[model samples]
Every structure is written in structure tokens, then in C-alpha cells.
Target: TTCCPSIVARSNFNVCRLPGTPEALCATYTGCIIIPGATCPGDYAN
Candidate 1:
């Protein structure tokens, strides 16, 4: 049980699901990954 207290409208299907180095995909791609490693951070808790 938790209280998601706040007010923000947005959708980020991917946050730390970096396809590669954060400096590389500056355009933000769809393929959740080019390689799989960096675990998805809790940014999705939004």
C-alpha cells in the first residue's frame, strides 16, 4: 500500500530502458533496447 500523491500528466513507456548509452539515443527510439542490461529504474512508478 502506498499513496501516489501528486499531479502530473504524461506517459514515458521507457525511462531507464536505455537502448544504449544515454548520450547515444538522443532521439529516443522504440526498441526498448539494442542490448539488454541497464535495469529499468523506478521512474515508471509515476
Candidate 2:
């Protein structure tokens, strides 16, 4: 779960970050952005 709702950018690519945290996730919207401060839903963790 996310403390904040997902933000949608008009551009093809966007950067997502957790405020006050060093964690961030960036993508071109071809994939999903995992919510910050939350465990990855599956085996995506490396």
C-alpha cells in the first residue's frame, strides 16, 4: 500500500520518488511502478 496515490505524468516517461526518502522508481509506463516503502508484490526483488 502507498501512503500517497500514484501520480500520473502526461509524458511518456516519469520519475516516482518517495518524499523524504532516498528510494525512487522511474519507468516509461510500459511497466508498473511499485509503491515506495512497501514490499515488492512478487519475486521482482533481486
Candidate 3:
């Protein structure tokens, strides 16, 4: 799964699982940014 920078910062769940060496999670503390994707189609309150 893709790492949501904001979520990682707020939630701070360690070791986000991705599919590569430089995985998105690896940049958690370093402030990594990713391309925004489609949001859930519901009344999300995050």
C-alpha cells in the first residue's frame, strides 16, 4: 500500500509496508511526499 505522508506524520505507524527498497515508509521521519491519489468516495472525516 502507498504511504500517505500526512497519515504517517499524524498516526506515526512505524514501518509502512510497500513494494521497494526506498519504500515510502522509509521516509517517514525524513518527510517524504507522494503523489495524491483518488480519495475514498464516502463521508470521510479525517
Candidate 4:
């Protein structure tokens, strides 16, 4: 059960963190990274 969401953060594009944390990965559209805090999802752990 995984997918994408475009609510990605603005400045936090440094952008590689884990679990619902402030950090996240940025892409063209939708949530492509896993941020457990976000309730969103992605591929890869780091």
C-alpha cells in the first residue's frame, strides 16, 4: 500500500530523512519519498 502526493515541502529539499521527520525527498509531483510523519510513501529507506 504505497503511492504519491504533491504536498511536498518547499525548502526541505536537502531532502533525505526518515519517518515523519521535517526532512524529505523532492520530485516533479506527488510524494516520491518515504516520510512516515507525512503519512505519505516512497521507495528506498534512505
Candidate 5:
């Protein structure tokens, strides 16, 4: 099982990098800003 939290980080703020990383594909929320050194949660190695 994965240990990383499901966080999102995107550019258009509409899409999402699912099944790979928690990196959000969109920033709809105000606090949706990408934090520095944050870890992505998903099947990144796949």
C-alpha cells in the first residue's frame, strides 16, 4: 500500500494526475498552491 497522502498539483486547475501522483492537475481552491518539496501520492514508479 502507498504511504503518501493524496495531494494534488496542476497547471490548468481542471485536470488531475491520477493513478500516478497526488499532484493536482488543476488549482480550483485558493490554497491549492503547489508547496515546495511536497511529495506526490500515486503509482509514480509504475
Candidate 6:
């Protein structure tokens, strides 16, 4: 399997999920950001 990235957030906008799938709909940052080839599925780290 393939799953690494994992930085889900809300309010400021942040997406990246794979653990179970169902979390990727925020877009609009201004402080924290880390979206490069985002991925998720296991060993997720928020």
C-alpha cells in the first residue's frame, strides 16, 4: 500500500487523508501549509 502525507485541518483550509478516506475539501492557507504530493491511508500524522 501507499500512504504517507497526513495533515488535515479546518478553518484555514487543509487537506490530506487516506486513513479510511474521506477528508479533502479545504483550500486556503495563510500560516501552516504542507501540500506536496499529499497522500494518506496509514500511519497518518496530524
Number of the top-ranking candidate, with lDDT as the measure: 3
lDDT agreement with native, every candidate: 0.29, 0.35, 0.41, 0.36, 0.34, 0.34
**Tens-digit lDDT track of model 1 for 1-46:** 1111111311122342344436225214322222234443344223
State which candidate has the highest TM-score. 2
Tell me the lDDT of model 6 at 35: 51
When sorted by TM-score, best at the front, the candidate numbers are 2, 3, 5, 6, 1, 4
What would the per-residue lDDT of candidate 4 be over residues 1-46, giving only the tens digit for each residue?
2234333433233343333444333333224444347444343222
35: Cα error in model 2, Å: 0.2
Q: Estimate each model's TM-score.
A: 0.17, 0.23, 0.23, 0.16, 0.19, 0.17
Task: Give stretches of model 5 more than 4 Å off.
Answer: 1-12, 15-30, 40-46
- Model 3 gets an lDDT of 0.41
Q: What TM-score would candidate 5 get against the native? A: 0.19
Over the stretch 1-46, how does candidate 5's per-residue lDDT look in tens digits?
Answer: 2122233323323244434435443322312444445453353211
Deviation of model 5 at 22, angstroms: 20
Off by over 4 Å in 6: 1-9, 14-29, 40-46
Off by over 4 Å in 3: 1-22, 36-46
Query: How accurate locally is residue 22 in candidate 1, as Cα lDDT from 0 to 100?
Result: 60
Cα-based lDDT at residue 31, candidate 3: 49
| Residue 12, candidate 4: alpha-carbon lDDT | 35
| Model 3: residue 37 alpha-carbon error in angstroms | 8.2
RMSD of model 6 against the true structure: 9.1
Tell how far residue 24 is off in model 3, in angstroms.
1.6
Clashes of 6: 2
